[PDB]
Amino acid sequence: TWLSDFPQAWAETGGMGLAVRQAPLIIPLKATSTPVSIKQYPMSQEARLGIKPHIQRLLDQGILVPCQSPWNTPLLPVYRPVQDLREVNKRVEDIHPTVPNPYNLLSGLPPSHQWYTVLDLKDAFFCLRLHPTSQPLFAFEWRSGQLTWTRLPQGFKNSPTLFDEALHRDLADFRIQHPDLILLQYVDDLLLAATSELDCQQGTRALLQTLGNLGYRASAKKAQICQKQVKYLGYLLKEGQR
Amino acid sequence: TWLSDFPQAWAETGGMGLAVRQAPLIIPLKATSTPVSIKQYPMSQEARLGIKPHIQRLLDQGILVPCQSPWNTPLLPVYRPVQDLREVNKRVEDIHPTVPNPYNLLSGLPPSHQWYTVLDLKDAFFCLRLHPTSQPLFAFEWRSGQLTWTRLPQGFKNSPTLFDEALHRDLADFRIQHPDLILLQYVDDLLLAATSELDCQQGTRALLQTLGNLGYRASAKKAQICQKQVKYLGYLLKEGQR
DNA sequence: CTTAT
DNA sequence: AAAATAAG
DNA sequence: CTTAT
DNA sequence: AAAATAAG
Numbered sequence: 001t002w003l004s005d006f007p008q009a010w011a012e013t014g015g016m017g018l019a020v021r022q023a024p025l026i027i028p029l030k031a032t033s034t035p036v037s038i039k040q041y042p043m044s045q046e047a048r049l050g051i052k053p054h055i056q057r058l059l060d061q062g063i064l065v066p067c068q069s070p071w072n073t074p075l076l077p078v079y080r081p082v083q084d085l086r087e088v089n090k091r092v093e094d095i096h097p098t099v100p101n102p103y104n105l106l107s108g109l110p111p112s113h114q115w116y117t118v119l120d121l122k123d124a125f126f127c128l129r130l131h132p133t134s135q136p137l138f139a140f141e142w143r144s145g146q147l148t149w150t151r152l153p154q155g156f157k158n159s160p161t162l163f164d165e166a167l168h169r170d171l172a173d174f175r176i177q178h179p180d181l182i183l184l185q186y187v188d189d190l191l192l193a194a195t196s197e198l199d200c201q202q203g204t205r206a207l208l209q210t211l212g213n214l215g216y217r218a219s220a221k222k223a224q225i226c227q228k229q230v231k232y233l234g235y236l237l238k239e240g241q242r
Numbered sequence: 243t244w245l246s247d248f249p250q251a252w253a254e255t256g257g258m259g260l261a262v263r264q265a266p267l268i269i270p271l272k273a274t275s276t277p278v279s280i281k282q283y284p285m286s287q288e289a290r291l292g293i294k295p296h297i298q299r300l301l302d303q304g305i306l307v308p309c310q311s312p313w314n315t316p317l318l319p320v321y322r323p324v325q326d327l328r329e330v331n332k333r334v335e336d337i338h339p340t341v342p343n344p345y346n347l348l349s350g351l352p353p354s355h356q357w358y359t360v361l362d363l364k365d366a367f368f369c370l371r372l373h374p375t376s377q378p379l380f381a382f383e384w385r386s387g388q389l390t391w392t393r394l395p396q397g398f399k400n401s402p403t404l405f406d407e408a409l410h411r412d413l414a415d416f417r418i419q420h421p422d423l424i425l426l427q428y429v430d431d432l433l434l435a436a437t438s439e440l441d442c443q444q445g446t447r448a449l450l451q452t453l454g455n456l457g458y459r460a461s462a463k464k465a466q467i468c469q470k471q472v473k474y475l476g477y478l479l480k481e482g483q484r
Numbered sequence: 485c486t487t488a489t
Numbered sequence: 490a491a492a493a494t495a496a497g
Numbered sequence: 498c499t500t501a502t
Numbered sequence: 503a504a505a506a507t508a509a510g
Contacts, residue, residue: 041485076485076497084486084497155497283498318498318510326499326510397510 003220005205008212010220011122016061017217022166024131025152033091035070038084040141043077048143050079055142063126067148069136082155083140089157092137099164102233105184111240113182113193115200117207118224118232121167122217124188125152125159128166160187170214178203184232190218191232200226245462247447250454252462253364258303259459264408266373267394275333277312280326282383285319290385292321297384305368309390311378324397325382331399334379341406344475347426353482355424355435357442359449360466360474363409364459366430367394367401370408402429412456420445426474432460433474442468 008014043051058064074084121127130138130150138156139148152159164187175183181203182193192207194200204225211218224230228238235242250256285293300306316326363369372380372392380398381390394401406429417425423445424435434449436442446467453460466472470480477484 038486043485073497074485082497086487086497089497280499285498315510316498324510328500328510331510 002204002208002223002225006208006212009208009216009218010212010223011217012220014212014217016063017121017123017127018129018215019127019166019170020215021170022128024129025134025162026131027134027137027156027158028093029091029137030093036087036091037070037072038074038087039072040074040143041076043075047077047079050077051075051081054081055147059147063149063151064147065135065150067136067139067146069139069146069148071137071139072146073138073140075140075142083138083153085138085153085155085157088137092157095158095161097161099161099187102186102235105186106233106235106242108184109182109191109193109237113195114228114240115194115197115226116224116228116230116232116237117192117200117204117226118230119190119192119207119211119218120222121188121190121211122219124163124216125154125156127216128152128163163187167216170216171210174207174210178206183207186233189233191230191237197226244446244450244465244467248450248454251450251458251460252454252465253459254462256454256459258305259363259365259369260371260457261369261408261412262457263412264370266371267376267404268373269376269379269398269400270335271333271379272335278329278333279312279314280316280329281314282316282385283318285317289319289321292319293317293323296323297389301389305391305393306389307377307392309378309381309388311381311388311390313379313381314388315380315382317382317384325380325395327380327395327397327399330379334399337400337403339403341403341429344428344477347428348475348477348484350426351424351433351435351479355437356470356482357436357439357468358466358470358472358474358479359434359442359446359468360472361432361434361449361453361460362464363430363432363453364461366405366458367396367398369458370394370405405429409458412458413452416449416452420448425449428475431475433472433479439468 003010003013055064071088073088075081076084128151130152135148135150138153139146152162164185167185171183171185180195180199184191192200192203194203208218230237245252245255297306313330315330317323318326370393372394377390377392380395381388394404406427409427413425413427422437422441426433434442434445436445450460472479
């Protein structure tokens with residue numbers, strides 16, 4: 001099957017990802033920023049017990065590490081952990097938003113290509129390492145001491161754009177090696193389009209091989225492979241339409 | 243004094259006015275209007291006793307008369323009577339508003355004329371007769387039966403413009419006979435301006451003589467006569483300014 | 485929990 | 490202007 | 498009183 | 503959206 005032929009490429013089989021070609025990201029602060037330390041509002045035991053195994057899993061994976069940081073933002077109860085990074089986001093320098101909106105992205109899909117594969121990357125932001133100089137920015141309290149992220153975190157205002165740009169760099173060669181394929185990227189949502197069933201097959205094989213080699217991981221459960229009809233970015237792609 | 247020389251011209255001395263050159267006004271209705279009869283909400287005895295002598299005075303003056311009309315609008319308590327004519331106003335055809343705003347009106351006042359007389363006409367709208375065909379429009383209940391107005395009423399949406407235009411017609415000749423005077427009209431508020439004190443005197447004498455002959459009445463108590471400084475339309479007119 | 489709309 | 494919502 | 502803003 | 507206001 002597709003699952004057995006590409007064990008590195010699927011999240012179910014290849015382990016947590018890590019984008020090995022991408023240098024750890026440095027997050028520039030605005031020119032006047034200083035750290036902000038917001039104390040953790042006490043969490044109920046129910047929420048803490050809900051969050052705890054997620055925290056432990058992330059620590060086992062090296063995605064969280066202990067630290068001491070002059071930055072601190074609160075975790076809130078849902079259970080799965082969500083960090084209120086609004087005060088960090090305010091102090092981080094803005095970048096240009098380069099992620100295209102889905103409407104315009106879909107305009108680049110010609111009627112000559114109607115064999116589609118749709119892949120979504122699992123834990124996409126976590127595949128991008130954070131430079132140790134920027135890791136203390138995202139610290140939170142866990143009960144005593146702080147933890148922080150060694151990967152690009154959820155809730156950080158620039159993660160979608162940074163991820164989109166990093167994947168574009170990692171897939172630049174794939175595009176050059178397959179000039180007859182159409183590859184649409186929307187952060188962690190990918191659409192490959194081909195003229196024939198066969199070229200979609202051989203293209204999807206190359207793309208999964210490439211993704212897994214680069215350290216990204218696609219969801220086997222949700223993958224729509226080599227179909228004439230697929231759902232992508234909330235559209236149903238059926239017969240040139242939408 | 244000015245009071246004794248022009249007894250017909252002042253409200254204090256010449257009786258209620260009546261514009262004898264002005265034909266009784268016909269009030270055209272909108273093309274689709276039919277009469278509206280709003281019942282009188284009961285008035286307290288206190289309000290009725292407050293209103294009663296005003297009603298009796300107006301009846302003595304012929305400004306109110308008994309009638310039976312398919313139109314009826316309510317009187318409200320203040321005591322002095324005020325009629326809610328909003329439903330009548332909605333059914334009466336609109337006219338172009340020709341009363342200038344005071345700012346632009348004052349632009350027509352050159353610096354060569356700095357001797358001023360300010361007159362305000364008392365009970366101005368009541369000087370204009372209503373044609374009997376239009377009198378039933380303004381009927382109200384008085385406790386049993388209806389009364390209505392034989393003169394242009396307060397609260398009617400077109401009274402200011404109709405009065406301004408009627409007075410302009412009645413003073414057209416005065417303007418032609420005194421081309422060196424400036425006469426500003428704002429409904430019932432008049433300003434005469436002249437170059438010298440003497441010409442303001444002889445002009446103010448002619449204007450009062452003319453007003454009284456036409457059936458209008460100026461307030462002697464409030465009159466500012468032949469002064470280099472006067473209050474007009476909320477401005478203080480002092481030394482070319484304002 | 486707080487806080488932007 | 491403030492509670493009702495959505496969101497970090 | 499009702500009702501427009 | 504509704505009470506608070508001004509107005510006929």
